[PDB]
Each structure stands twice: as C-alpha cells, then as structure tokens.
Design a protein around this nucleic acid. Structure first.
Lengths: 76, 57
RNA sequence: GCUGGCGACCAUAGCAAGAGUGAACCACCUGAUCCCUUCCCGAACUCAGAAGUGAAACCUCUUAGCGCUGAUGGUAGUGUGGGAUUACCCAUGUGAGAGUAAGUCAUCGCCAGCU
RNA sequence: CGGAGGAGUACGAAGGUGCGCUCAGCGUGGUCGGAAAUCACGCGUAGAGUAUAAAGGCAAAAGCGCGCUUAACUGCGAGACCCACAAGUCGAGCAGGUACGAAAGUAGGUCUUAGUGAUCCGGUGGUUCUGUAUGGAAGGGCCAUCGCUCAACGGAUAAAAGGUACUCUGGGGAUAACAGGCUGAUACCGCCCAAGAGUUCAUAUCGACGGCGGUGUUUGGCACCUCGAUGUCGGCUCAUCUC
RNA sequence: CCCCGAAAGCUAUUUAGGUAGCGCCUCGGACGAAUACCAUAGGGGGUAGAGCACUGUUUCGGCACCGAUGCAAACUCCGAAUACCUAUGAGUACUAUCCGGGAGACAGACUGCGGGUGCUAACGUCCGUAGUCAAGAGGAAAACAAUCCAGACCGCCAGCUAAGGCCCCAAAAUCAUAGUUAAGUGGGAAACGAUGUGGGAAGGCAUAGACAGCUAUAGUCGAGUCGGCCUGCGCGGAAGAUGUAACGGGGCUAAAACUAUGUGCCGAAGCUGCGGAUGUAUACUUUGUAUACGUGGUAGGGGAGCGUUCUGUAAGCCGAUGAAGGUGUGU
RNA sequence: UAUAAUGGGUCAGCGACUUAUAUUCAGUAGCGAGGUUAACCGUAUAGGGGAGCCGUAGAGAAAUCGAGUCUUAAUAGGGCG
C-alpha cells in the first residue's frame, strides 16, 4: 500500500490581460501567488497580490528600476 | 498581379487549418483551378498548403 | 569650469587600486545653556556656534585588475510534408546555450551658488 | 492502488498607525568561559528571518523594536476572475462614526495560498411585520447569533451486525478458476571474452567477473474468445509428429 | 422516399453497466459580418536544448577552500520552435451570437508524436495531441475494422490519373543507359569471427634489384609487394513438433534481385465527357424557369407520401353480358 | 463478428407506444383590450345559464405602497420592474 495519492485543486493563476489590450477600471490583470509583477501607474494591488486597473487605458509591461523588477501599468 | 492555383491532392485527412486555407483560397476539389490576387495574405495560405497545390506563377 | 539639491537610467554605467580638491559649498569640528535625546552613553537625533583640519568622508581623475557587455560562422533543438523506428535522414521555414574576435572606467534634464 | 510532504489550528496582540533599526557567517583580541554564553573591532557576504508544510515572494523591507490605540467598524459597491449548479475570489469609490500622524495620508484583521459542513429541526437577543369575531396573547416572519470526526466530509433514517455446502431468481465472457491467444520477466538451450584449475600447458576436460541470442516444455503478466455450459487429476485402450 | 447528423467527455451521486446539469446533434424564431482562415503589429512565459550562478550529487590533484571534470522530474546564471491573447487589413465562405421545441450519449478501439507505470514486455494500463474506425463503400498491402490512396445521387461496352505496378496465373516495358550481388542474398534474427568481392584517402620497401620459395645475412630469379584506416553488397553465428510452409504461386542470375537516371503505359465508385433526378440560395419582379453550390451514414431530429378496415358524400356509380377472393400475362 | 457468440425446422393466421384527465410549446380558425362558459335547464348538437378562469402591473417576508417599490440615517448607491 502506498503512502502517496494526494493533491490539491487547481487555482487558475496567470496573466489575464496582455500588452496592447484596452481595459476598464476594476479589470483584473494578473493573478499571482507572489509578487512576480509589480504595480505601476494606474494599477493597484490587492491583499493576495492581485493586480488590477484603476483607470481606463491600455496595458503595458516593462522592466524598470534598480532591482530589475517587472512592472505593469495602464496608459490613459 | 494574379496567379493560378490548382488542387492536386485530397484534403479529406488534412489538418483543420489546412482545410480552412484551401476553403479560403476557394479550391473545392481535386483538379479545381482558381485565379487569385498576388498579395502576401493569399501567399501565406498558399505556402501553408504548398504540398497539395500547384502554382502557375 | 567647480559646488549643492532633485530626477531620467540601472554595471559598456559596478567593484578594486592609485592620485588630487578648501575662495565658496560640503565635510569633519567646539560645548550641552534653553528645545529635544539614548531600554545606558550629546555614539546617533537636536539645539547654540566658528577656534581648527581637508586627516577621515564625499566628490573628480587615471588604470582593463576583477566584474559586466558581446559579434560572425558552426552545433543542439524545432513547426509543416515525406522516409525510417535507440530517436535518426531528406525538402522547406526557424534557430539557441556555451565558447571565440572584440568593447567598456557611462550618458542626459531642472534649479541655486562660485569664478 | 504514480513520486514526495502538510491541515481539521494560533494571536487583543502575533491587529491599526507614527517613528526608528537590519540578518547570518568567519577572523582577531578580551575572567571564570570553553567547539559554541556576553564585549569591542574588522572581512566578505543574503547563505538569517517571516506562528506552521512547500511554493511563489519580501528594502517604501512583507524581517525586527517602541508610544498611542481598536478599521478584527456600520450601509454599500462601478468593474472583473473562476465556475454544471450550489458555492468561491479581488476590488477603486461613496456616506456615517473612529484610531494614529504637524501633514499629504494609512487602516473593512494577520506576506499569500490549508485550519472545514448545505438543508431540515430546535435555543438566545432585537423588531415602526403578522395575529382565524374584536382587544391582547400563544404561535409564525425578518435581522443577528448558537447546537455536526453528518471525516463514506453534495451530508439515503432520529434510530441498524453476521451465516448459507440446505439454497433461489434476474444478468455478465462488461469480470475470475480450465484449455486457446499476445508477451517472454522467470525457465530451459546455445554462443562471445577469458582471471584461473589442469606436475609445465586458458582452450584434453572444467572455467570466475562480465556480454549476446534461440525456443515456447516451467512459475508468472494481460483479460482478446467461450458463463441461452468449450464439463475431468491420474489410470486403461489406441496413437501421431519433432530432434 | 427526401434533408441534416452525434457521443463514449467534465462535475456530482450507497455512484461506478443507472441518473442529473454542462459539452457535442436537430428544428423554429430573431439578427447579418459582430466569425473563421492568412499577413502585419503588440504581448507574457520557463518546456526542448543547454549550463553549474543556487540546492544536491561525481572523479582526479593542491592546500571547507583553489585548478581541472561529469550529472538532475520535484536544480536554474540562460533559453527557442510551436501554441495562446489582442488590434488592423485583402480575398474566400451561410460564419458568429441570442431566444425557444425535441433528443441521443456519459463500455470506446487502433496508429503516429510527447510522457507516467510495466521489463524502453504485451493486440498491457493511464494521460495530452492529431488521423481513421465506430457511423464509410471503392483501389493497394495474398487473405487482413483502426495502415496508404480516396469520400459512393442514378445510368453508359467513353477518356485522364492517385497509391501501387508493367515475365505467366492477372491489365500494362522480357523498355533504355550505367554499375553491384553468386548468397535464391532478394524472400526472418544479435554480440562476435573471417586473404569473399567493389570503391576511396594515406603510409613502408623496391631494377645499387623488393615478397615468397630454395642453397650456407650472400646467392640463382625479374616487379611489384607489404600492413593498416573509411565505405557498398555479400558469408558463418541459425534447433520443433500434421505437409513443402520465413517471395501468394509458377518460376527468376549481363534478373523477373539491388542502386541511380529517363521515356511510355496500366491502374479507383477520385477527375472529365454524355443523359436523367433531387435539396438550398440568387435573379425571372405568379411562374416552374435559368445560374451557383450540394445529395456516404448508426443513435437521434425534421419534411413528404403509399396501401388496409369502418362513417358521410351514396335511394349516387359498377355488377349474372359475372362482384369479392384465387391464379397467370402485359404495362 | 463468416465467426466455432445469441435467436429462428417450414408455412398460414394472431402478436407490442394506447386511453382519460391536467399542463407547456408549435401550427391553424373565430373574436380581439378583451376572450370564454361549467354544472344545469332545454321534445335537446340550437337557445338560455357570467358563478368562475385567463389576460390587462410590479416591488416587498409582510403590513403597505404603486409606474414604481425594497434595502438604508440617506433624495446616495444598488436589486427587481
């Protein structure tokens, strides 16, 4: 008899809106367990590290800063 | 400015996108020949199914 | 042409070693009266000041020393069609990683002082 | 019925806010004191820590202290994620009342993802709802909350173990025991290399450590045929083929 | 008789060969480019490969470190091709979406590619992805659901081709040009063994005389010889039970075998030709007419019909100059 | 599945999606902001019989309001119309 045989339910993480798409305020952009992407301009962060848009515009990804962090922002 | 395409093999067992490329060029059966505009958009469909068409350029 | 502040950028821009700067600015610097301060200490924070020094520190300059960047060519992988089954070959499209040649001791913007 | 680990909790501070601080390692010296207690100074460096398993993260530190406090609030909520349903997740912003800051401001529990149980039936608090002639009341409704290892965790009842060779019916070759089939781990047979044994001499005859095949006599693996029946362990009689 | 046409999945279930919601089919209504194929532009990734910067593991040196050197599903300093999301655009196509009526199905199979398990066993088992069967006929593979070619409306004693073939069974080349094989290899199988033969790149010695043999390095003779590497096709290794039985058979050796090239032909229910039928759509601005695209089908859904008995129409019409029924013939 | 899986020796005759009620959808006919009677009476498929049913208005648990209503301190926001 094996001592294995368990696993957890899926969580459906990942990027929901890619670069170049238009969003409205409140749209969820990234679902993530940790902070792989950071919040840029017009982007807010939830209590579970979810990134969402706070204004209408176009999504844009970039790499910025002295630590080389990945940022996502919304251009109005 | 226009080119002639002839279907030379069957399309029954091919991939779905290959069948759709044939339908988008307008070929309907073996031996069918059509005349289409010479544009990159048409050339892409032709190049995808190169192996079962003949082009009179 | 120097000094200070605030940004763009985040190593071709960083570390390391060596050398300079006191007119102004900055830095150490004097003591602790009032404001304020340390689970103790005027060491840090703070106030009241210029008798000393550019020693340290911060800046600027030089160096390929460490680091970083990096081709061209080839190789591996791979979508579609065909031929084979120890995982290859042909046609067509695509194309790394490592390594080699080589490069680098940054580049810009706003304001205020001194010549 | 693949390979590995965790959960059925904890905390009125381990929550909020303002201000402040950086780990771990090694090396020198310094009483007991040393491998390793505390003190001081250096070197290189995230390898420390995050209540708890791992993963994704963590400098405006999300790590570590101090003062004051209760936003671990009420009414909501544009817009999204996920999804058979029932459920689950994120959320700017608006109104009221607060806490901490000089202030711009931050706060609708804790770095996040586990710490859970539908409906029915009852219990407790409140209520400008209803009240079987009428006025009350009993009972019911609405809002808040309590009683599940219902753990077979979408939970058949408030309440439940066994025997049948004395057996019976509806079905299945959807599924086992015999024989057939596929396979060849195992079994048997053959070959390659050759330490050595053989008074000397690998190969007269054996042959260690290793390697490559053949057959379909063994023990097995699979479940393709047969369950509206292919009905046998050995003996007797009679055989036929292989090398 | 005509038209369309699935599934054997997900979730839950005292559930596992039952059922329910969703996914897949069909019919009606609304509404038309909002859809798809391809091109261009924007975007995130951590797989193949690779590497040792972390976590582990590995060999040899020097003194845990230093220099070389390997490995990894639960390692990553790196990192594709494809897939996926969005926007714009030409051309082609009854595409997409919404609201309702009716379902079936929830036992799948094989083959290729990427994998877990198993022995890198099984026509084994469990996933992802594509094709075929299921529900699909025709030609080829001797026979052979799942392989290759190809999607059957009906008729023809017409033509062209696909896979595969052209000595006879049995349709078409005893075709053409160069080579290889002697094993019936072709037409079953390994490690290993061997002067079998064809081709290629080098090397050693040699007419002051090379190899072999022979006389005691010299010597008689008279040109090549010697040992390796790469490569094409062959040989041994090779034993089974009813009957040759491991080319389908006959038979085949300057092939009727293998390699390369070329010119013709055969070959399907594919395509074309002639005649006929039918579904949908667009125009004739009734038409039943032309054009265009279609017509393989299980479970299912939709449409249109033929016959049988009885009631009205029927106190009608047919009937002993012969009804119903039975048995032939023609159409 | 030719299957060595099931059923049928053969012929003739018989043999399996119905009936009643309720409900929903689609065709078709009458009337139409209206439509329609049931039991019953009736020398009776006529004619009477309007009790009742469906449609015409939602919101809210309900009292209550009503083109609005519920939640709320809120005329804010939001849900159903």
């Amino acid at each position: 008899s094996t001592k294995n045989g368990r696993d957890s339910n899926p969580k459906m993480l990942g990027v929901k809106v890619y670069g170049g798409q238009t969003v409205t305020a409140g749209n969820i952009i990234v679902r993530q367990r940790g902070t792989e992407f950071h919040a840029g301009a017009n982007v807010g962060m939830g209590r579970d590290h979810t990134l969402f848009a706070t204004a209408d515009g176009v999504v844009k990804f970039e790499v910025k800063g002295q630590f080389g962090r990945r940022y996502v922002k919304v251009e109005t | 400015k226009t080119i002639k395409v002839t279907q030379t093999k069957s399309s029954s067992h091919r991939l779905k996108n290959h069948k759709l490329c044939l339908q988008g060029l307008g070929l309907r059966r073996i031996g069918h020949t059509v005349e289409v505009q010479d544009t990159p958009s048409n050339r892409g469909m032709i190049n995808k199914v190169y192996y079962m068409v003949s082009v009179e350029e």
